């Protein structure tokens, strides 16, 4: 027994949910029906151009989106909600930060909207206390 | 008394308490940094470039999460009066060293549980200076790289070369052979293997293990440190490379010895502990020796092998002592430490007694180890073939009446002057009561033995007489030896650099002294802080990772500089800074250190976290956080913000938090530590109560009617002892992971602080808190037992047996289980629940 | 709404609550009686003595503690209108039937856990009529005695003779051979042995258990009922003697068959659960079949042997079916029951498939079993030797859409009249929805089989067509089959006596009907009570142990009497009384039965304990006690004081106690029981909630704001489902022993009320409460989890995984462990702690 | 899961527990000193005559033996206090009422006081709650 202390919570996990906010909301518009992807994967910045040019090569178009107010963590699970979630088709409503390599492909969340109208409000809360961590809505004036 | 003059803590909702813990966590992501460690200085050997050295170390840069191998470039000159902050250059090119969600092997998780190393990535690495080899264990398999040996110093990060294997399972404990850097060694499946990095050639050397069944049926291991050694004697390896190479002289073959530990864990009791996979609902067997039960039957053995010029394992050979180890060395229960002399001549080993009162250092020359075969005629043959002169030399023999703390400091010298009479340095606490370095010269006079017949050695049969024992330090302070501290012996200038508590027990300072003459002890660190230091191998500059109770930890690089004619007065001048002190929280108050005297006029130190927004006059509820047990000092002049942030959270809610270093704690010498000899529990809680009385008198906000005593591991054990023997003072008692029955605990700790069950009977029943359960309170909501279910150290049985005896005595409790956490709460979710449960329990029932 | 109209429970101290439980204990001891059971009528056949019969039974006199074999003397003539209370004479002379302080073997304590035998002493005995042999197990050693066969009766008690053995270990499950009472048989080390009382000669018959190592390495047992069979199909023996003696005729020898179940449990998952000896910290392995995992590989086998007039087992012989069992009988997962036809012609067995919607009774004639030897030419040889005509007859095949409840009623008549075409009785719930008796005549039409070649059976392969299936009972009620009820078939008068719920669902009455025509169903018991009955084998007189919701249990002895030409209308006249009705304690108020209708307009019954010293106007805190699961009916007109005194203690503190049997609870037919099919856990809580709102409307003292839901096995699972899916009505939830993850529970239960996880993923995710932990309350002290640590039925893992998911979701709880108790809190001290914890939790937080 | 009702609480306390105090109080006037044997054995009626005959042919005396009013619950040990324990010798204190067959000598408490004088007090109580199970003072009037 040499001091089996609790050691608090290191939570060595910050400043990366901003740079995985920018990969969120991948939209594909060949007809006016639009489909969407979401990605949340930590610990590096060389993942960003690989996944960005990946969805560029696989025909998903960019938009700048709000970073989280406080960055999230890995080893833990988060929920995806909002006006477009539930009403329009979100099959992975559960997301989770877990590290995968810069080169390799990722878990997504497929989200169809169809004729989106003028806006789709979306949310990523945490599954711990459902604090409103992340906020957005997409704009057809920024669609391709 | 005055219920309008006592502080009532604002009762928050459960979600409120989570909001508070999360707001604490919003900057604990800042305050934890995992400051760099395991430094290796290498010179640039340029004399025309810009950088004088390259410092290699482990670190998490907070551009990434897991810690990684890094380096800094220490320049030849610095623009003075303007401080240089060293960049954290990444040595490797941003790969990850943990699998997804932290999944490890069970042996890796057990070893990390042993060292309590909570951070992820490359845990620790091994380095060889000449080749510039970095052999480390990262992710799935061993890796290596090099930087500036016969090759050069890179500027970009490189790729880590993987070590391929045909073997299954993890490859634990890897080490480079110093005599030949191409060769290395590791433990796999509890047997010693050796490989070669460039050709990929592997070789098993020991066959004490077979992998036939579970560990209940495959009991012999080799080269691995057992449980009690890992968790009480802080030795994590059981094999030591020979640092020099001998030549067998057949044609050109270079022999390479390895000292290893054979372990026969057949008779040691087996306990089942739940696996981390709760779904599988199976256990793991653990060879866990209780007090009085048989410890593993140990022995030392030489594993040699011979290689060609091209680096292929030509021959191999297990070797064993000419007589059995148990017979040549009676009363030897534990091999605390071992290694080799620097010239390679003798292999030393520190033995230790069953009662831990008879430590003795011994040298075992490699010719004492014959080859090991079942053929008793080859065995007799080489018993005649062993020369008469070669002999184990019991060089040093520490004997005490209290207990021997294992001090790993032992620096034997080259003995090129007058080639007998080994001269060494040795930390000796039992002599003066305090750990002080000595230079000891023992004369190695061999008497000549017939190793053919088997005989029983006497009491001090191999004991060499001492030529001289100059004491290099003396006083009422001690030299740090345990907890991975070390000495650094510059033999060129004849100085020895050590760490110590010469100013005060609350700080660790780097001191230097000459071993030629016990002269003047030069402090190198600034006072008013506490320092963890690490020297260069060239003894020209060191690092100090230091902190104070007020300032967070910083990591500064100092440079010994001055006239070379008097190297003892070389002035350490601040050269560059590596890590600066981080931003303290907006709602952090530094705690106040105090001291006081007992009725016996023994000086105890203590901490206090004052209540935030204190209004004078009001009495606040007080959480006596406690550990109290040996080998741990809670109070020292170091930063308490990273490990004891919950204590600040308590203060921020309005609880006075008191911390007292009761008698029996470390850093303060053997006579201080030894007041708990055979009376664990019977003196510490009295000192804690005394501290509370003192802090109550000094500061005016300690409500004696509202006292909580919270503790963990050994500390919880005291919280339960507090609620039993001092029930009127402690309102509640949050006992986390308590040791409730001493008779169930392991040998290494208990057989030392107390004795064998037949010897100290009243000490076991008085100290086993679960057998005094009738004296626990009749009132409810006064006792909260916390326990990690998968515990390997303080097993769940202890809480289970406590709850059993509470049931039988009809006493209430509360209980919280952490089904995934082993001994330290490691998962952040479980730690957040633990703290909100602690705040809620105090809020409602204190 | 009104704090002047909301009843406040008096906050007692913890010692106060103990004082209340002890005052319950003193009265409680008198209330509990351990009523006489296992009755055995024997005639006296004297016509000049005083006593007509001798009734033998188990009981505790109360002079002593352990229950023992006793007898009463039933006279030829009672003095009318003056009740005869029987003397309880002892067979044995006050010896210890169990060892000191209740120590058993681990398999004995496990068997008493499966049978739920809380009482100590001679728990079960075996009897042979003609020899008058009483073979029983006392203090882990077989004993025997004899009373009135070829010998005479007694008036003094005798010494019970011990049976000497060379076998090391316990001798479990003894049975007298009915064909030869000098021979008996038992299980030792999970292998079938056979012995002879007077000569002492023992003899092993099976060799499936090598005894070499742990049960992970020695997986074959024989004559042993496995876990899932013991705990879900209520079968505890796995071997059945042949009741007749056949003569193969070498020269004079006599065969004696035994049908047994060989079980090869190698491929079934092993789980470790902590042993009772906590100091050792070792576990026990248990071959526990998890849901979805594969069941043990079962098979039926004949262990025969041949003996002589001198009384020695001369020959022996294992036999096995001509094809392997799994191939000759596909879709056969469990052997529910087995035995023999009374003439000895066929060995019957009830098979049952893995969906548990397909049960079929089969007759296996002994010639179908060839000898067993590893020589495949001897095997083919006797495959040629078995006749072409002989055949297993699948006589009966129940198929359902809900699930098959195992009905152990099966009375094969002698078929020597009309020498083919077996006529039997059989309980059938799947046909009409309710368990009703039928007389079924099938036709054994053998087509001729070549047993040497292996064939694949078809879907209706051995299925004999039915000649006729006359229905002897019909209605909205059921014939009691399970839980050790039985029928009694007088073949001389041609009547079948059964138990049923025909008068009302709340009462078990003894009925009789003729199996020639369903003329009328004559009740033989007084209404307003519920009866557990037991007939003489001469069918002239019975015992009934009966009770009501108000009156304690009495045990009256009735005598069937009337003109013999009309046996169906024989009037049961009360002859004598055995154990008259005990004293209800003065604080005990018998509870009120009610009924109500749901929104589906189905009638649910319920109980209520009114608050003692009820004040009109005042609203009271309500404890919804709940089980709500299948095979258990809480609400019935029967004494709720010996088993539900805690509910009265709650009432005596002022809590309204409500008990509801929603849909799923048995004795109300299959369609009622089947409302939980594949949504178990989901519909019960709506029935419980509706029961609260009805009782709230009916009686005016139900406070909806303060509702507690307490449960122990499935009840604890429902209490947690209540707190999840109905949070606004249920204030707190004391969940004991809860089933938190269905995927972890065993096959027999779960695979029947839901099914395999591949089939019902939505039902498992919506029913496993531990996967729905996010919907538990954020408020603290609303959830108390109780669990016995050494549990083998609802393993500790369930509570552990719940606490795990609570930790991960950040939700508070409270928890109490009972470290030494398996599934029921057995020890009275631990039970007292459980009750004071329940009272305290309600007192403080409800 | 067949409903362990779990009412339990089966102490099954015997009315023999008053006359287990009668076995209590054996003293012997062989030397100048006087000493006592204490027995508490339920669950057999024959233990009375058995330990009676055994300890009068072992030369001991029977005293008054006041009976406990409560038939004591089985499974719990009962402690011994008083003015006797702590001044004059009592070798074991606590008594567990466990069964043995009447042919065996049981566990007994041995109590040496030397000279008797005005008497000295012995008490038997429970450790579970500390309520009075038994209480008396010895006689100088029921001796030879």
What would you note in describing this structure?
- Chains B, C: Belongs to the peptidase S9B family. DPPIV subfamily.
- Chains B, C: Keywords: Acetylation, Aminopeptidase, Cytoplasm, Disease variant, Hydrolase, Nucleus, Protease, Serine protease.
- Chains B, C: It is an enzyme of class 3 (hydrolase).
- The structure is cut from a larger assembly and holds 2 copies of chain A (144 residues) and 2 copies of chain B (846 residues).
- Chain A has 144 residues and is an alpha+beta fold.
- Helix content of chain A is 11%, strand content 25%.
- Chain A is built from 2 helices and 8 strands.
- In chain A, strands 1-2-6-4 form a 4-stranded antiparallel beta sheet. Chain A has a 4-stranded antiparallel beta sheet with strand order 5-3-7-8.
- In chain A, strand 1 (26-28) and strand 2 form a beta hairpin.
- The radius of gyration of chain A is 16 Å and the shape is globular.
- Chain B is built from 14 helices and 46 strands.
- The relative contact order of chain B is 0.09.
- Chain B folds into 2 domains: 14-32 and 584-845, Alpha/Beta hydrolase fold, catalytic domain (Rossmann fold, 3-Layer(aba) Sandwich), CATH 3.40.50; 37-579, Methanol Dehydrogenase, Chain A, CATH 2.140.10.30.
- In chain B, strands 13, 14, 15, 16, 17, 20, 21 and 25 form an 8-stranded antiparallel beta sheet that branches. In chain B, strands 39-40-42-41-43-44-45-46 form an 8-stranded mixed beta sheet, with helices on both faces.
- Chains in contact: A-B, A-C, B-C, B-D, C-D.
Q: What is the topology?
A:
The structure is cut from a larger assembly and holds two copies of chain A (144 residues) and two copies of chain B (846 residues).
Chain A: E1 26-28, E2 34-37, H1 46-57, E3 76-82, H2 84-87, E4 89-90, E5 94-97, E6 111-114, E7 120-126, E8 134-138
Antiparallel strand pairs in A: 1-2, 2-6, 3-5, 3-7, 4-6, 7-8
Chain B: H1 14-31, E1 37-43, E2 51-59, E3 68-75, E4 89-90, H2 106-115, E5 125-128, E6 133-138, E7 141-146, E8 161-162, E9 172-176, E10 183-188, E11 191-196, E12 202-204, E13 220-222, H3 227-232, E14 239-241, E15 246-247, E16 254-256, E17 258-264, E18 270-274, E19 283-287, E20 297-307, E21 313-321, H4 325-328, E22 334-340, E23 347-352, E24 360-364, E25 369-371, H5 376-385, E26 393-397, E27 410-412, E28 423-428, H6 429-432, E29 436-442, E30 466-471, E31 488-490, E32 495-500, E33 509-514, E34 522-523, E35 530-535, E36 541-547, E37 554-561, E38 571-579, E39 592-597, E40 603-609, E41 620-626, H7 645-653, E42 656-660, H8 670-673, H9 684-698, E43 702-712, H10 714-725, E44 732-736, H11 747-753, H12 761-767, E45 783-788, H13 796-809, E46 814-818, H14 828-845
Helix pairs in contact in B: 1-14
Organism (chains A, D): Homo sapiens
Region (UPA) (chains A, D): 1-144
Subcellular location (chains A, D): Inflammasome
